[PDB]
Each structure stands twice: as C-alpha cells, then as structure tokens.
C-alpha cells in the first residue's frame, strides 16, 4: 500500500493572463499542497505552518532558483513544441507531474509525466528506466535523451533517492497536520419538487478525503438510485461531499444516510428531520 506521496505539478503557459502566471510549481505531501513557486511572486513559499516552521532559508533560496530556472526551461520547451507541431502563437501549455510514493514494504514508486496542449507528450517510469513518447514529436526528445544517457540517470537519482529522502523529512515536519482526523459534520436536507422528495446527505469539513456516504432503504443500500458529488476541497484543507436520492414523499422516513469516516469512532446514520 501507499503510506505517503510527494508530488509536484508544474503549469507553464506561453502567455500569462489573470490568475494564470507564466509558471507555477505546486508541491503536495499526501495530496495536500505545502509549497508553491509562482512566476509573479518570484519566490518559493510555504502553504502550511509546518513547512514554514521546519524549513530554513536555504530551502526557500534553492527552491526559488529551481523555480526561476524551470520558468526558463519551460519557456524554451514551449518554443520548441510550437515549432515541432507546426502551430501558430497563442495560449499553449506544458504540464508536468512528478513524485514518489512510499509503499507498505519500504519500496519506492516514482514517475514523471509531461503533457502538452492537454495530451500526453513524454513520460518516464522508474521500473522501465525509459521514456514513453505519445507521438513522433515526443520520439525526437526521447531519442535525444536516450542517446546521451544523462536525463535517465538524473531523473532516476531524483525519483529513487532525493524525492523519498525529502518525503521522509516532510512526514517528520508535518506529522501533526498529516495524521489528524476531522470527522464530517453530516446534515440531510430535503425539498419536495414536481411531486418528488430530493434528499441530500451533506458531509462538511472532513479530513482525510477517505469517506463512505450511502443512502439506505430498509436493509438495502439504494445505490442504483443514488447520485454522488465529488470529494472536493474546502479553502482550509478539509473536504466536502454529498449523495442525493429521489423518494416518494410518503416514503421519506424509509430513507437514511450512512456515513463512515476515520475521524468518527462509530458509523453514523442520518435522516431528514424537516
């Protein structure tokens, strides 16, 4: 199983706009943002008290230079793909995800993926130690990188050594925020509409993301009649979700919502109490 993950998402665009910097790098530990570089701010910065408190200034200074240097490589990378795919100017996007996962048996999963203009470009897998190119145009990068030996060695080293070394430290520094359990506050709303009762089970403010929200009628889960929202983020790092069913309003009292979450000592059952 995956105990912990460190991931970086890069977004690089050819022309900035309101709320879209030329370049943004975001770090996540266990799915939670903790750091950001943004080309408008020009500095790497903490998104959590725990990285602020544990990082020293060499961390922010080095990440800052790595963000700025990335800004410049993605700018050249965009010009290169622009020429290669025979495109005209305007909004173009390079994306990257990369990171490692610490597994139950003390093993390291890690990968690096690049997207261009919303499709796969090129990807690297630790196990294979080789690049998969999406098309002939990525096959040119792959051939260059493969021919020289250097890029494979540098990414492996990072994804197998430095990336999990940093992940172990971040789990050290963030233990209190990352191990914490906040139970959902659960509330069932209902409105009658065109002669149907819509019943919604809302789960507010829970952490972590892992949750069971189901509607039951009698002894059965009424899953075929249920619609679920996403598990979606609140502004404060917690999560929100819901589950909705339609009922005959004479049957309202036959419906209840079961919720299970690691922050709740017991599963709860919720009904509409008008």
């Amino acid at each position: 199983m995956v105990l912990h993950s460190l991931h970086y998402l890069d977004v690089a665009v050819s022309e900035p706009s309101p709320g879209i910097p030329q370049f943004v790098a975001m770090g996540f530990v266990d799915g939670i943002p903790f750091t950001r570089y943004d080309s408008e701010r020009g500095r790497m910065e903490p998104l959590t008290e725990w990285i602020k408190d544990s990082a020293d200034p060499e961390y922010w200074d080095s990440q800052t230079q790595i963000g700025v240097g990335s800004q410049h490589v993605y700018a050249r990378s965009l010009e290169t793909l622009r020429e290669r795919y025979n495109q005209s100017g305007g909004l173009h996007t390079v994306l990257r995800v990369y990171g490692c996962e610490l597994l139950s048996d003390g093993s390291v999963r890690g990968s690096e993926r690049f997207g261009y203009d919303g499709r796969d470009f090129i990807s690297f897998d630790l196990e294979s130690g080789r690049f998969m190119a999406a098309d002939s145009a990525a096959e040119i990068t792959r051939r260059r990188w493969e021919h020289e030996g250097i890029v494979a060695e540098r990414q492996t080293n990072y994804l197998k050594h430095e990336c999990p070394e940093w992940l172990q430290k971040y789990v050290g520094y963030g233990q209190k925020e990352l191990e914490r359990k906040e139970p959902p506050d659960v509330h069932v709303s209902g409105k009658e509409e065109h002669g149907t009762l819509i019943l919604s089970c809302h789960a507010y403010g829970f952490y972590p993301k892992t949750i069971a929200v189901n509607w039951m009628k009698g002894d059965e889960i009424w899953d075929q009649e249920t619609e679920w929202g996403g598990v979606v983020p609140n502004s404060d790092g917690t999560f929100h979700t819901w589950a909705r069913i339609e009922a005959l309003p004479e049957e309202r009292e036959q419906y209840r919502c079961r919720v299970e979450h690691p922050g709740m000592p017991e599963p709860g059952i919720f009904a509409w109490e008008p």
Binding site: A25, Q63, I66, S70, V73, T80, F114, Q155, C163
Partner: peptide, 9 residues
C-alpha cells in the same frame, strides 16, 4: 533538492 528543473525538450 526536492524540486528539480525539467529536462529541456
């Protein structure tokens, strides 16, 4: 060094 620069295309 936690983040790394991407390789050039």
């Amino acid at each position: 060094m936690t983040m790394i620069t991407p390789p050039t295309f």
